[PDB]
Design a protein around this ligand. Structure first.
Ligand code: K
Ligand code: K
Ligand code: K
Ligand code: K
Ligand code: K
Ligand code: K
Ligand code: K
Ligand code: K
Ligand code: K
Ligand code: K
Ligand code: K
Ligand code: K
Ligand code: K
Ligand code: K
Ligand code: K
Ligand code: K
Ligand code: K
Ligand code: K
Ligand code: K
Ligand code: K
Ligand code: K
Ligand code: MG
Ligand code: MG
Ligand code: MG
Ligand code: MG
Ligand code: MG
Ligand code: MG
Ligand code: MG
Ligand code: MG
Ligand code: MG
Ligand code: MG
Lengths: 126, 195, 123, 154
RNA sequence: ACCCCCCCCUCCGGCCCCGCCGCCCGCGCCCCAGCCCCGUGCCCCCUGCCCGAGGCGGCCCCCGCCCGGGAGGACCACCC
RNA sequence: GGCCCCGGGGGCGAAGGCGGCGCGCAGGCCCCGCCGGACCGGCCUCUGGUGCAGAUCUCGGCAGCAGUAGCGCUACUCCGC
RNA sequence: GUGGGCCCCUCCUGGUAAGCAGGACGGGCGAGGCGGGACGAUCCGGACGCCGGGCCAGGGUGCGCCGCCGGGGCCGGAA
RNA sequence: CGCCCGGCCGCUCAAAAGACCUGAACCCGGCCGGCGCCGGCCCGCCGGCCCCGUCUCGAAACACGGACCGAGGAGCCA
């Protein structure tokens, strides 16, 4: 139920990269797009504009995809998949797919507790 | 968090204004007394023409929207200080609300301790041949209605304080006889060790 | 204020952040210390513990004097937590004595992201 | 069409009418002008409005409503006397007070108006004829009205 | 000096006095010269850091309409 | 088209909807609570009528404006009512 | 893809001249973020991944507004 | 069914699903809280920020298109 100690997690930006001028129009969604206009101020990157996406923000390769509790993730639906993917693993913890019912969440949870795997949505449906 | 009270006799308008503005922006309360005895360098006529040229500027289509030109020395000093404050922000407005400016010495300030700013006084700033004039007289030429009143009030109070000082002399001669508190000498010696 | 109650101090003022006319850096505060009119006379207040009182909750923030500024006795300081703009024009205390506040006077980037390679241990 | 007042562990009298052929803004102002009264005086006041002895003050829909002397102490200078709205609101008030008295032997002397809600309903669509061969609309704004009575708000 | 500024004259936030009648806040007074500058070229430097009431200076509060006439008037307002 | 170790997830609650955390430089993905009430996918190979802010775009709904602008042919009144 | 360019520095041609029109080596804007020149596509520096520390170019250092003192002088435009 | 004089209570049903599956946006009414984007700080201060798309040497332009919202909407095939 505990992972091995790791390097300290660094996020280079804490907020999300938001589309230009999506605060003025409901019809323009906040999902990121690349500015491509001839007089675009955010394309020119004058001062005071929103920050722009680039590969300089990527995470350190040893900590990328690591959840706050120090485990990497596997997403599973059946006891067969649980056993297979967590045969001799000490880096990932499991998660139950959202469509799995209460009846079988019981059985997955028992088998996981036996194996010694952490589950990240243990107490969803009581 | 006391107040600084400055006697504006002798001082140059712009130099005193710069001092007061910086002091206000450091969160200080400042009053200024005797604003009609502050000094503007140059010939009185040149000063006069400059202030009338200022007065010519108003909004053409409605003068109630226009720049307002105040005629009393206190508000002339206040407008000059606003020129050096960023008053359209909250910080600048607080600095303004911390100021006070006066013609003569009124009773609300008559028992404060006054100070001066010699590095902005005209007898140290201006060359002996340079002309100079006082704000009260420019104000009287541009429309201030109350010169004679301020002089009568100043005369009366100066006589009153001249009486007070005579008692003050002897009251000090008793205070000064306190060369007999050894609980004070036992530390004046310690002061001396460091001075 | 129940810890620094009896501690006498030299007075100071928080006048603003470090800035140019284009840019403003809120990591560093510009601070005025009374009786300090010279760059050379800043040696004595250099490296000293200081504090400011944040009105809400009445509690102090602790910090340290780091560096001179200009030719005229201004200093730079870094506080435990960067300061709000509301606190400008307020007073700063420079302590004559020593107080152990532990880690509680040092800035946040040095506290975390300082790179000791602090491995998250998990007990 | 459900109730908007969803308080629980209180003893209330409820009434309601859906799709009312009366001006929405007039009816809204009438209901807000009686909110908070005791039921006796709400009836007296509504009858006075009917007789032009008092007014309905107008917040929120007032461009073109005239200023009048009877608005002298209300917070605005604008009011009117909506007679069809007063008819509808009196009838709905009587229904609610009857409901509360018959559900508990509570008197009109401890009842107050504690809630109202007005909303816009689907209108009747007629037509009007404009110059140069054109046709434009001539709709109506009817309203949904509810009204709640109960014990003193504090 | 037909020029300019002020008075008279028009509007006028705010404020003051007087009628019927409680709260709070702060603690600091020489004057006048600078080619007499009269013995200078200092003080203060702790607004809490241990300060805390009279006198002297501030602050807050304090006052109806409807109704009908008119010398008043789009409605309002205004004067009775 | 296949696989999904006694044969993939589903009325012990599918798709969709409304709020909230997490992961990713990002396009996006994943989980939880509430609604809903019958279907849905991850990986490999195959196919295309495959991704919108704009076109005086098309069709539908609809706001401010606003209780606004506005309602020739002389004329009605009292009582039953 | 492009085959409408434009500006600066020096050198020129027509014109009274023009923020006019036509040519030349080199550079720039176009298609170049940042600071400064109050303000400007092109001037003065410097041409760009995301951050922490240090040094500082060009321009400047009464208050607005980040930054200073000492010393020696003086006190738009034509004939 | 009962009660007032259309309303309220409750009744069938797993459920009102009650003129009907789910029921988004734009826009609005009642109660409760407060008075544009980026950055720092817990939070109202300080700093920076012209309206996009387009043709153009050159657009914030007193150049043109665009009140709002949903769904559709343009290099495929021989
Ligand atoms: K949006
Ligand atoms: K362009
Ligand atoms: K005149
Ligand atoms: K006259
Ligand atoms: K298809
Ligand atoms: K209209
Ligand atoms: K010519
Ligand atoms: K380029
Ligand atoms: K280039
Ligand atoms: K175009
Ligand atoms: K064209
Ligand atoms: K062109
Ligand atoms: K443009
Ligand atoms: K353009
Ligand atoms: K223009
Ligand atoms: K314009
Ligand atoms: K415009
Ligand atoms: K154009
Ligand atoms: K045109
Ligand atoms: K065109
Ligand atoms: K346009
Ligand atoms: Mg017609
Ligand atoms: Mg016709
Ligand atoms: Mg298509
Ligand atoms: Mg487009
Ligand atoms: Mg040209
Ligand atoms: Mg600039
Ligand atoms: Mg400065
Ligand atoms: Mg439905
Ligand atoms: Mg248009
Ligand atoms: Mg679409």
């Amino acid at each position: 139920i505990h992972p091995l100690p790791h390097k300290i997690i660094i996020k280079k930006r804490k907020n999300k990269f938001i589309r230009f001028q999506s605060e003025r129009f409901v019809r323009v969604k906040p999902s990121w797009r690349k500015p491509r206009g001839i007089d675009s101020p955010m394309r020119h990157q004058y001062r005071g504009q929103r920050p722009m996406v680039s590969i300089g923000y990527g995470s350190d390769k040893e900590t990328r995809f690591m959840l706050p509790c120090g485990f990497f993730k596997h997403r599973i639906s059946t006891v067969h998949e649980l056993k297979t993917l967590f045969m001799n693993n000490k880096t990932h913890a499991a998660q139950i797919a959202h469509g799995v019912s209460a009846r079988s969440r019981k059985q997955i949870l028992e088998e996981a507790k036996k194996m010694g795997v952490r589950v990240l949505n243990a107490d969803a449906k009581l | 968090m006391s107040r600084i009270v400055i006697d504006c006799k002798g001082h140059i308008l712009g130099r005193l204004s710069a001092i007061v503005a910086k002091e206000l922006l450091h969160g200080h309360e400042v009053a200024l007394v005797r604003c009609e005895k502050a000094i503007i360098s140059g010939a009185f006529r040149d000063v006069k023409a400059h202030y009338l040229k200022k007065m010519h500027k108003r909004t053409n289509f409605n003068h109630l929207r226009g720049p307002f030109h105040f005629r009393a020395p206190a508000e002339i000093v206040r407008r000059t200080i606003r020129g050096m404050i960023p008053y359209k922000t909250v910080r600048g407005s607080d600095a303004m609300s911390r100021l006070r400016v006066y013609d003569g010495i009124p009773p609300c300030c008559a028992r404060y301790k006054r100070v001066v700013c010699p590095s902005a006084m005209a007898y140290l700033c201006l060359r002996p041949e340079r002309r100079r004039c006082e704000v009260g007289r420019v104000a009287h030429e541009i429309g201030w209605q109350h010169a004679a009143d301020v002089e009568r009030y100043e005369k009366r109070r100066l006589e009153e304080c001249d009486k007070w000082y005579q008692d003050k002399i002897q009251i000090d001669k008793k205070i000064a006889e306190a060369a007999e508190k050894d609980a004070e000498l036992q530390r004046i010696n310690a002061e001396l060790a460091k001075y | 204020m129940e810890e620094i109650k009896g501690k006498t101090f030299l007075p100071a003022i928080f006048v603003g952040y470090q800035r140019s006319r284009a840019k403003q850096r809120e990591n560093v505060a510009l601070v005025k210390v009374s009786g300090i009119y010279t760059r050379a006379e800043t040696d004595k207040v250099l490296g000293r513990l200081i504090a400011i009182i944040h009105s809400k909750s009445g509690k102090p923030i602790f910090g340290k004097i780091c560096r001179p500024h200009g030719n005229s006795g201004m200093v730079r300081a870094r506080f435990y937590t960067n300061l709000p703009g509301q606190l400008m024009g307020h007073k700063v205390r420079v302590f004559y004595d020593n107080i152990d506040v532990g880690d509680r006077a040092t800035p946040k980037y040095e506290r975390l992201y300082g790179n000791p390679n602090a491995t998250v241990t998990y007990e | 069409v459900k109730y908007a007042f969803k308080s629980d562990n209180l003893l209330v009298g409820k009434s309601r009418r859906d799709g009312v052929k009366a001006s929405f803004k007039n009816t809204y102002s009438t209901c807000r002008a009686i909110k908070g009264m005791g039921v006796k005086r709400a009836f007296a006041y509504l009858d006075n409005v009917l007789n032009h002895k008092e007014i309905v003050p107008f917040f929120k829909f007032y461009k073109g409503v005239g200023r009048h002397s009877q608005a002298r102490g209300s917070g605005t200078d604008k009011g009117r006397w909506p007679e069809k709205s007063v008819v509808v609101v009196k009838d709905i008030l009587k229904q609610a007070v009857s409901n509360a008295k018959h559900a508990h032997k509570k008197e009109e002397d401890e009842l107050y108006v504690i809630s109202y809600c007005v909303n816009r309903a689907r209108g009747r669509r007629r037509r009007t004829f404009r110059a140069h061969g054109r046709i434009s609309k001539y709709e109506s704004q009817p309203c949904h009205v509810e009204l709640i009575v109960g014990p003193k708000p504090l």
